[PDB]
Amino acid sequence: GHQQLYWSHPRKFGQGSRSCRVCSNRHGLIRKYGLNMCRQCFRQYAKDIGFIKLD
């Protein structure tokens, strides 16, 4: 029963289903606009995405 108790837990919802796309960590996520990105690397990779602080 290893193959059925391994993934008996549903991940249709909850904060463990969604993580980062670099660190794959489950905190600080900006789900808006389908980013699926942690905010810490978002500031680091703001130049590679485009985001700048004009005002």
Partner: peptide, 10 residues
């Protein structure tokens, strides 16, 4: 305008 206001600090 896409207003993204987050932590500057890790």
């Amino acid at each position: 305008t896409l207003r993204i206001t987050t932590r500057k600090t890790p």
